[PDB]
Structures are given as structure tokens and as C-alpha cells.
Design an enzyme around this catalytic site. Sequence first.
Site, PDB file in Angstrom:
ATOM      1  N   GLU A 145       0.769  -1.252   0.000  1.00  0.00           N
ATOM      2  CA  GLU A 145       0.000   0.000   0.000  1.00  0.00           C
ATOM      3  C   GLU A 145       0.811   1.320   0.000  1.00  0.00           C
ATOM      4  OE1 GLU A 145       0.443  -2.014   2.532  1.00  0.00           O
ATOM      5  OE2 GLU A 145       0.435  -1.028   4.488  1.00  0.00           O
TER       6      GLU A 145
ATOM      7  N   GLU B  70      -5.577  -2.796  -0.366  1.00  0.00           N
ATOM      8  CA  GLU B  70      -4.569  -1.737  -0.453  1.00  0.00           C
ATOM      9  C   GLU B  70      -5.206  -0.346  -0.346  1.00  0.00           C
ATOM     10  OE1 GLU B  70      -1.923  -2.876   0.135  1.00  0.00           O
ATOM     11  OE2 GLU B  70      -2.139  -4.946  -0.514  1.00  0.00           O
TER      12      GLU B  70
ATOM     13  N   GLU C  89      -3.142  -4.518   9.851  1.00  0.00           N
ATOM     14  CA  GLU C  89      -3.443  -5.638   8.973  1.00  0.00           C
ATOM     15  C   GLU C  89      -4.774  -6.315   9.307  1.00  0.00           C
ATOM     16  OE1 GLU C  89      -2.229  -5.883   6.323  1.00  0.00           O
ATOM     17  OE2 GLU C  89      -0.365  -4.782   6.499  1.00  0.00           O
TER      18      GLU C  89
HETATM   19  C1  LIG Z   1      -4.124  -9.808   2.708  1.00  0.00           C
HETATM   20  C2  LIG Z   1      -3.205  -9.389   1.581  1.00  0.00           C
HETATM   21  C3  LIG Z   1      -4.044  -8.851   0.442  1.00  0.00           C
HETATM   22  C4  LIG Z   1      -2.138  -8.410   2.070  1.00  0.00           C
HETATM   23  C5  LIG Z   1      -0.839  -8.464   1.274  1.00  0.00           C
HETATM   24  C6  LIG Z   1       0.357  -7.731   1.858  1.00  0.00           C
HETATM   25  P1  LIG Z   1      -0.085  -6.168   2.659  1.00  0.00           P
HETATM   26  O1  LIG Z   1      -1.061  -5.412   1.863  1.00  0.00           O
HETATM   27  O2  LIG Z   1      -0.717  -6.481   4.076  1.00  0.00           O
HETATM   28  C7  LIG Z   1       1.404  -5.129   2.798  1.00  0.00           C
HETATM   29  N1  LIG Z   1       1.266  -4.355   3.991  1.00  0.00           N
HETATM   30  C8  LIG Z   1       2.697  -5.933   2.790  1.00  0.00           C
HETATM   31  C9  LIG Z   1       3.402  -6.104   1.610  1.00  0.00           C
HETATM   32  C10 LIG Z   1       4.592  -6.819   1.605  1.00  0.00           C
HETATM   33  C11 LIG Z   1       5.076  -7.378   2.784  1.00  0.00           C
HETATM   34  C12 LIG Z   1       4.374  -7.205   3.967  1.00  0.00           C
HETATM   35  C13 LIG Z   1       3.188  -6.485   3.969  1.00  0.00           C
HETATM   36  C14 LIG Z   1      -0.412  -9.878   0.993  1.00  0.00           C
HETATM   37  O3  LIG Z   1       0.057 -10.605   1.918  1.00  0.00           O
HETATM   38  O4  LIG Z   1      -0.524 -10.300  -0.176  1.00  0.00           O
HETATM   39 ZN   LIG Z   2      -2.231  -5.130   4.408  1.00  0.00          ZN
END
Ligand SMILES: CC(C)C[C@@H](CP(=O)(O)[C@@H](N)c1ccccc1)C(=O)O
Ligand SMILES: [Zn+2]
Length: 889
Positions: A268, A302, A324
Site C-alpha cells: 500500500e 490496499e 493488517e
Molecule cells: C491480505 C493481503 C491482500 C495483504 C498483502 C500484503 P499487505 O497489503 O498487508 C502489505 N502491507 C505488505 C506487503 C509486503 C510485505 C508485507 C506487507 C499480501 O500478503 O498479499
Molecule cells: Zn495489508
Amino acid sequence: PKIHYRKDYKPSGFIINQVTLNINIHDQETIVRSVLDMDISKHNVGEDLVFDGVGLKINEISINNKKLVEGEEYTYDNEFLTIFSKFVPKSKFAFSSEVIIHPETNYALTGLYKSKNIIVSQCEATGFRRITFFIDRPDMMAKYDVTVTADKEKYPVLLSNGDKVNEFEIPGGRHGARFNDPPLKPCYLFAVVAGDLKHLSATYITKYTKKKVELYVFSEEKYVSKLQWALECLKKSMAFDEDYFGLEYDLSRLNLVAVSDFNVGAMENKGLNIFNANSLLASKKNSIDFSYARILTVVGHEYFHQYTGNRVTLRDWFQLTLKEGLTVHRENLFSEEMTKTVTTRLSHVDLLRSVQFLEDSSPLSHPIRPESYVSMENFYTTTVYDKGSEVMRMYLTILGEEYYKKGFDIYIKKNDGNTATCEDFNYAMEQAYKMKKADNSANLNQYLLWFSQSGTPHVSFKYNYDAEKKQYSIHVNQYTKPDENQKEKKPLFIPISVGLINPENGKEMISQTTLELTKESDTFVFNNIAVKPIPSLFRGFSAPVYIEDQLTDEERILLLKYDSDAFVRYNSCTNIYMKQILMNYNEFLKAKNEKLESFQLTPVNAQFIDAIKYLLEDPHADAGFKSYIVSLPQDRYIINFVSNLDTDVLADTKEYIYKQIGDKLNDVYYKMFKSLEAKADDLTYFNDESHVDFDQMNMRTLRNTLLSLLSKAQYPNILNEIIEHSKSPYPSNWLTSLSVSAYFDKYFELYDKTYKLSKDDELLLQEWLKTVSRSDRKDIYEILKKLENEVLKDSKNPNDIRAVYLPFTNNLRRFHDISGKGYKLIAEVITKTDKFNPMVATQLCEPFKLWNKLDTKRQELMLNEMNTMLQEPQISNNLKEYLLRLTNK
Ligand SMILES: CC(C)C[C@@H](CP(=O)(O)[C@@H](N)c1ccccc1)C(=O)O
Ligand SMILES: [Zn+2]
Ligand SMILES: [Mg+2]
């Protein structure tokens, strides 16, 4: 091996007010220049100035434009740059550096890296330090001024956060762009992109302030036609946040960018969200149905981060679930509203209770807010995310929509533009709770245990009905098993959404009611209950717990047929299956152990089979829901209820039960498969990428589920249907025709057909790979070797590697082959992958997570492989830490 403790949080002795970056991309190297405008904080105690900096090649370091001397004034060990305090100024100063990095050979996909022909960054959680020196932690808020330069032909499109304030030509065919992003942000939200990107765009006008927002979605030129659905989803996301939460987007522009190489789903970064191509790109001709809900959720996710993550930020990584878990919850509400199908909520519960319950009863078990970590990259778990989302969702169940929105608004209003902790959120909800209870003395202090206590609570029930008094009692008990995190578990605040069904006419007997269980046990009594009810318990799956309903199968069947709540119906069916599975499992196990020449199996309940038939034949019933009831519970849900699980006996158990039901319903299955065709495969909007019909996709899921059951059953002439199915325009259909053909001589014929259909689309090919990998083939090991030699090869693309290997690990008979050959294969892949991408190597460990839950031979086989992996001299810290925890070493 440093361990970070949550209780040890202290603010930095330094301040970073301004970041000024010059990122110069060249053929063989990228030069990064950085000026940090810094200060000394009130917490400073004369310490050395220490920056994170991993794998950086130093050209020069300076303080106030005076070059620093290596060895006398600073040391750098490729992880930390230490500047001895005596050389650190005592007021506002400028620190500058110029380092060299190499995106081209960065295959770990963290920091700045090259994906195909795109240069892209990934900084969460600790990736910014791979780009330049920084105090790389989320409470270090700074302003950013970023200049990117590159060869104009190769990288015409340049993007970073904030406003593009200048564009300029450079001698030698180069060009640059400067972006200024004045609002403070943590460094993990920084991003840059350079590439030959093509886009779709749109203008969104906000609901209240009427601000016009430019929306851009980017991909490589080859797949720009696959961008349309993503754009629609983004529009949907903004509307939802506006309508449900009253939150508008605050920037003038929002960019979404798809890249082919990405460790997870998306990220994001402020104004510049970056996506795994498989979670942004789709077309009807080149994607399976699943891509459409996937893009909806990841784009939504996102977008919702912009408030819950980007505007209200984390004080430290221990608060991860606050952004999260809360953002997953926001995405879940969004998707349920957008899809308008009950299977959306069911699918999230199905995920929690298989994958997250497994984790929570494994040696990896942790609370959604851990007390410590070694590796931040291993912190991002289904526990923190999905149990986190369930804990976030329980506030809404407890408060109801109106007071929840009030609590949530208190949270945003009070913390927008600041860092925050899980306590700040509980506080905000507590204010709502107070208002709702009309009681200033009400609190949610006990609720906080949901953040600190690991393990899945068990909730069990007993009932009493006094016919003469018209009085019904539900006695409730809660229990969490002690584990390595708490010796003594305390009672949680558990909200139990309940109804009471009149078994005589199927009607609701009471209004909506949420029982608030706050003690180890309680008795809830209901008056004026005219007849003995069947209790409908934990409607909507109202708490993340093991439900032990103590109902008879007759009672569960009546709920399955007549209850109003999709989850309780689905769960009653789940529970009927589990009773059957446990019973047949033990019968098979006993025959095996005793080497019996003959024995008996308990048949599947006939009234249960009749109820399945009744529901399937109901034309007004939901196709998605139907597909759930003809499917046994997931293997990784089942394993939570069986000690020393023998996978072969479980495979035999499942086979018996499926055959029992099929022997009765296959004619019904075939008839439905045929009658569903017209609506399910309707081509009317096949060339309209904005027209997505989740009910219709659920109809295909049902057809494809039935076809699979019919093919396994060897239903007369079903190969005919399989071959016709392979001619369908929808990839969900013709990939399904591939995997169900496994049980026939036509398999490799459809293997070649579907390969040719898939090979010229990167993402479609990966779906093909998944289908092959998951094929129920006796020669599956030889097939995998063929995939390796002919298709996968030496690809370092995480989508490719995961496509080939992970689906295969769900093959209950074959991955768990008693030789251990399956465990050996995946371990080889993990160790191979760990040389260039430790994050994905750890993802590939997932099959081992249940290692101590299997029969003693398989436990030993798995443990041997994990110990072999642990003995690799070059093993990453990431993988080593994970396997050390998993093996209880
Ligand atoms: C539930 C999913 C759609 C979330 C994403 C990652 P995120 O949007 O929580 C982002 N914060 C992130 C990116 C890369 C490393 C760690 C955290 C996913 O796990 O695919
Ligand atoms: Zn996330
Ligand atoms: Mg490729």
C-alpha cells in the site's frame, strides 16, 4: 541472533525531518544519493548515530557536507552504519551519503529490484535500508523529496510518492522526474517505479468535498488489456469507504502498478500501490474465475490501508495487526457488500478454520500481537491477518453497525496523522461500548486478551428445556489449551450470535441476540419459549473459536435445511461430516493396526444424504452454498481433530464417504451439471470486462465441483462431458477439464491442449501449472519432473515456483508418500529457493507446519528433512529462525 521485545519499545534518540533522494538508474548499477535533514530528540543520551543499511556499497558519507573517514569516524558491517557519537552534531544537522545498489541481481525482491523490465521497490517491512541508510522503523516520520533518473527509452514512465513537480531531459538519452511528498510518512511507505508502462485511467469525484482524483492503473504493454477490472474495483473501493465509513481519498492521484515478480499479493505505498500481477490483471479469456474476487479483495485491501495503515500509522511492528487485521476486516465488509453472496463470508471462515487454526495449535502459535520476534519477515501471518480480522470484526458484532461506525470514527478522528497502538483502537471502541450500554462504567479491558492470548478457544454447550415453564437454558463453557505462551489461559470476551429455531416449522423464535460470554462458563435462560428449540449458534461465525454444539445429527440436519444463517447451516453440515470422518477413520485405523481380514464401516447417515439431495434440488437455493455442502471439510481443518493422523487412513476415509454419498446422488449430480450449463456458461458479457457476476461464477464452481465428483466416481460416459468441457471459452472450465481428466486415458491429450491455450499468457500459464500440480495422477512425480525440465526450469519468479509445488503438497496420498519422497522434494526446493529468496523459501515450508500432528513415521520423515534444511551452511536467517521455532529446537 537479536530478539526484539515489545515491552522494550523506546523512541529514537534522533529525528529525521526531511529525506532528499536522487536515484540514478544505470545499466549495471543504481546510484543512490541521500541527504537526511536530522535533529537530536529529547530521548537522546549521547549514543552513537546508528543507521540501518543492508548490502550497500558506500561511495562516500558526510555530515554537514564534510566527508567522514571510514574506521576513525564510522564503521559499516553491511548491516549497520555506526557513526561514533563524538562526531555527531548536538543540534540540527545534515547527513548525506552516496551508495551503489544493483536491482538487476536483487532476486530476493525486497528493496530496489528489477522485475522483468520494470524497476520497482518493496520496502515493508525492512526493505528501505536496502536502498539507502536510514533509521528504518515506522515511528521515524519524515518528508520526502525524490528524484529519479534513467535511460528514457528503457524507462519512460517514472513514479514515486507525492506530486511530480519536475520532468527534465538529461544528456545521453536519459531523463528525470522529481516528486515531492510533503506529508510525513514512515519509510516503509516510500516507493519508486521505472518502466515502459502502459495505463488505463479514470477520474473519480469524491462524495463530500467533490475533489477530483486521478486514477491510474499500469502494466507492461503486453497485458494492458487486462487492467479494466482493477480500475472498476478501485472505484468500488473508494465508494465503499465513503458510504460505509464516510472516508474520502485525500490525494490528487492514485496509482496502481502490476509487476510480474512479487513476494506476496500487493503493497500500500502512499499514492503508489504495487501489485503482484496475479492480483491486479485479468480478462475473461485469460483468467480463471478466482482472479475476479482476488483482484477485488487485494485492490480493496490496499485502498483501505490508506486510512488504516497510511494516515493512522503504527508505532512499532508489534502493532502490525492494528493495520493488517483492521484492513482485512475492512476488505471483508467491502467484498461481502460487493459480491452479495454468502460464500464470501464462508470462504474466509473456511480459510481461518483450516490454515489459521492449524497455525494456532502448532509450535508456531502466537497471539495477534506477539511479545517478541527475531525476523520481521516472518511476522506476517494468517494469525496476525486473519485472526486479527476476526478480532476486529467482533467489535462490530458486539457494538452493532451504528455504534461501531461511531467507535471507528473516534479512532480515525483521534489518531489521524499520528502513530497508534492496539490499545488506542480498543479505547475508541470502548467509548462506543460505553455509549451503547448507557453506562460510563462499562469497559472493554477484558477484550484486550484477544491481542495477547495465543491459541484457539473451545466453546461447548449443554441445553435444558422445561416444557411446562416454557423456559430454555443454554449452558456455555469456554476453554483455551495451555501452550508455550501462557501456562494459564484466561476467559475471553466471547460474543455468541444466536437464534432459536422452532423444529416444527423452521421459524425464528427470538429476535436477534448476541450472548456476551465473559466468564469461564455461564447459563443463558430464555422465557416464553413455546416449544423445545434447536439452537442456531455463533451465527455469521461470531467468534474465532472451536464450536462444540453438542447437537444430534437430526438437529444439525434440521438447521442445515431450515436455519436462516448461512454459516450455521454450513457448520452443521461440517459437523455432521466430522462425526462421520472421525468414526470411519477410527474403523479404518483399527482394521489396519489389527491387520483384519474383514471389518465393518459405519455408513453415512441416510437422512443427511436426503437433506443434501433436498438442497441441491431446490432451484431457489444458492449455487455457491451447494458446492460447499457436497464437499468434505478441508484436510487441514480435519487434522485439528485427530491425533497422530495417518494420511493414508484419512485418504481412505474420505474416499469411502464420497463413494457412499455418490452411490446415492450421482444421478442428481449429473442432472444438475447438465441443467446448470446455460446460466453458468452464458457468454453474453464475455467481452465486457466490467461485467462481473459472482452468482454466475458460483454456478460454474458448482458445475466444476460436480464434474470432479462424477469423474472420480467414473460415472457412465462422463469422459464425454469432460471433453466437451475442455472446449469452453472459460478457463475455469477448461482447466477443470484437465484435472478431472486425470482419471482417464485422455489426460495427456488435454494436458497438451490446455498447455497450448495457456502458454502465451504469463498468468494463465501459472494457473495451468497449478492445475497440473494439483492433478490426481499416479505418475504425479514424473509429471512434476517434466514441469521442471520443460516449463519451470531455473525461473526465480515466485509465482512460477509456488504454482509448480504448493498445490501438489495438498495431494493427501502422494505428497505424504510413506517413503518421504514428497517431503524430500519440497525440502530440496526450499533450500534451492533460499539461496536467492528467503521469504518465498519460508512460504514453501507451509506443508511442514503440521509435522507433529501426523502419524509417528511421517513425523520423523518430516523432522528429518527440516533438520537437513537446518544443517545447510548457507541457510538464511529468515528460514533458520522459522524452522528452529517450528521444530521446537
Ligand atoms: C491480505 C493481503 C491482500 C495483504 C498483502 C500484503 P499487505 O497489503 O498487508 C502489505 N502491507 C505488505 C506487503 C509486503 C510485505 C508485507 C506487507 C499480501 O500478503 O498479499
Ligand atoms: Zn495489508
Ligand atoms: Mg516469466
